Write an enzyme that holds these catalytic residues in place. Sequence first.
Site, mmCIF file in Angstrom:
data_model
loop_
_atom_site.group_PDB
_atom_site.id
_atom_site.type_symbol
_atom_site.label_atom_id
_atom_site.label_comp_id
_atom_site.label_asym_id
_atom_site.label_seq_id
_atom_site.Cartn_x
_atom_site.Cartn_y
_atom_site.Cartn_z
ATOM 1 N N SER A 1 0.767 -1.226 0.000
ATOM 2 C CA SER A 1 0.000 0.000 0.000
ATOM 3 C C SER A 1 0.808 1.291 0.000
ATOM 4 O O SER A 1 1.802 1.378 0.698
ATOM 5 C CB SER A 1 -0.855 -0.075 1.296
ATOM 6 O OG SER A 1 -1.837 0.897 1.280
ATOM 7 N N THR B 1 -4.133 2.544 -8.539
ATOM 8 C CA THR B 1 -5.542 2.470 -8.148
ATOM 9 C C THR B 1 -6.317 3.586 -8.817
ATOM 10 O O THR B 1 -5.935 4.739 -8.671
ATOM 11 C CB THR B 1 -5.657 2.546 -6.603
ATOM 12 O OG1 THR B 1 -4.898 1.447 -6.076
ATOM 13 C CG2 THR B 1 -7.078 2.375 -6.199
HETATM 14 C C1 FMN Z 1 -8.437 -2.404 5.285
HETATM 15 C C2 FMN Z 1 -8.314 -2.305 3.815
HETATM 16 C C3 FMN Z 1 -7.333 -1.422 3.353
HETATM 17 C C4 FMN Z 1 -7.092 -1.218 1.990
HETATM 18 N N1 FMN Z 1 -6.132 -0.354 1.587
HETATM 19 C C5 FMN Z 1 -5.932 -0.192 0.250
HETATM 20 C C6 FMN Z 1 -4.958 0.681 -0.191
HETATM 21 O O1 FMN Z 1 -4.279 1.303 0.667
HETATM 22 N N2 FMN Z 1 -4.796 0.816 -1.519
HETATM 23 C C7 FMN Z 1 -5.535 0.137 -2.416
HETATM 24 O O2 FMN Z 1 -5.381 0.263 -3.633
HETATM 25 N N3 FMN Z 1 -6.476 -0.700 -1.996
HETATM 26 C C8 FMN Z 1 -6.681 -0.880 -0.679
HETATM 27 N N4 FMN Z 1 -7.680 -1.773 -0.254
HETATM 28 C C9 FMN Z 1 -8.503 -2.545 -1.235
HETATM 29 C C10 FMN Z 1 -7.668 -3.895 -1.317
HETATM 30 O O3 FMN Z 1 -6.423 -3.715 -2.094
HETATM 31 C C11 FMN Z 1 -8.442 -4.983 -2.010
HETATM 32 O O4 FMN Z 1 -8.951 -4.487 -3.263
HETATM 33 C C12 FMN Z 1 -9.565 -5.569 -1.148
HETATM 34 O O5 FMN Z 1 -9.178 -5.731 0.212
HETATM 35 C C13 FMN Z 1 -9.913 -6.944 -1.675
HETATM 36 O O6 FMN Z 1 -11.047 -7.509 -1.048
HETATM 37 P P1 FMN Z 1 -10.975 -8.494 0.234
HETATM 38 O O7 FMN Z 1 -10.638 -7.660 1.467
HETATM 39 O O8 FMN Z 1 -12.408 -9.038 0.240
HETATM 40 O O9 FMN Z 1 -9.901 -9.525 -0.056
HETATM 41 C C14 FMN Z 1 -7.856 -1.919 1.110
HETATM 42 C C15 FMN Z 1 -8.799 -2.774 1.639
HETATM 43 C C16 FMN Z 1 -9.070 -3.003 2.966
HETATM 44 C C17 FMN Z 1 -10.154 -3.980 3.395
#
Ligand code: FMN
Length: 339
Positions: free
Chosen positions: A105, A155
């Site tokens: 991230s 993203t």
């Molecule tokens: C707590 C959390 C933090 C996340 N932080 C980011 C991030 O900093 N950057 C990003 O592109 N996606 C972020 N995401 C989206 C995740 O990369 C990912 O698309 C998502 O968690 C996938 O679904 P899942 O939690 O059901 O596996 C985040 C998701 C969660 C749940």
Amino acid sequence: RLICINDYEQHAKSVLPKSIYDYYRSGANDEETLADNIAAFSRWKLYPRMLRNVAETDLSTSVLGQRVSMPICVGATAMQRMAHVDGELATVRACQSLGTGMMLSSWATSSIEEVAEAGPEALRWLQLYIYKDREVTKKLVRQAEKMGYKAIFVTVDTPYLGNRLDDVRNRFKLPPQLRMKNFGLAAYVAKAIDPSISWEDIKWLRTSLPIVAKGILRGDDAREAVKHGLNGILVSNHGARQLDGVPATIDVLPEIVEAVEGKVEVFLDGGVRKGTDVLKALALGAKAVFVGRPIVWGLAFQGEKGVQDVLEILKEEFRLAMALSGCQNVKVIDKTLVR
Ligand SMILES: Cc1cc2nc3c(=O)[nH]c(=O)nc-3n(C[C@H](O)[C@H](O)[C@H](O)COP(=O)(O)O)c2cc1C
């Protein structure tokens, strides 16, 4: 004690402070897509082949030309030090052990260099947000390049932060001794992240590292990413945390695989909890899947060892699902396996 991913979430709820558990758990608004990311996988049924000889099931594959041990990789989840003191250092060491990749991230609680130092031999990629400050943005890419990251996941679904209601109620904030180390979250985004970005900004970003567009839900947008010389598509609805009421990623994955006509790799995240979830996404055309929340739950249980256990459970579940489906390697997972 903890034998499936669901168990890890239950444990996490039991040890984490509420505002931290809620931050990690939540989806946007009424959380319809959050529920659907899961439910959708159950609607795709498996049609296993029998008597295929599955004595030595090989889970190995590649992601953007880099070998991995299994088509299950760690997706970007911000601020992992809220879950365990070691946070992203723990995650990258677990990935190194397992032979799979970590997507770091931009909003990590550990820096680009830090994580590279803790997991030299790990396959690692950088998730990038385009900051209004493009010098910040460029420095993130250049540090990734220098510190041996092998791709950039940009993203593209977060011009603004989704409205996660519990975070509003809890006044979500980092714990005091923690920072986003490469340099409330809604306001952060509004101040720091550029809502104006366009396809022209994608042209700007097209570094010689492979670039994957993270957050694509439409075939026409996938085609546009190809046209802009990107090297992959991560079919993602951001863990159901951005716009609520979009489809489940497994349901939109066939459109997107279709649209790209094999020109780039297509990945999925959103709702992966079980080895059959992995199998279904590969059957429908994904090269690999990313897991988000399961990793934070692994951290919450026992730091590096917890993340290694969550990945090992997924690996074993996937192995079994492959075997019971008649698949001795990932190359033989075909579309007739699902309906
Ligand atoms: C707590 C959390 C933090 C996340 N932080 C980011 C991030 O900093 N950057 C990003 O592109 N996606 C972020 N995401 C989206 C995740 O990369 C990912 O698309 C998502 O968690 C996938 O679904 P899942 O939690 O059901 O596996 C985040 C998701 C969660 C749940």
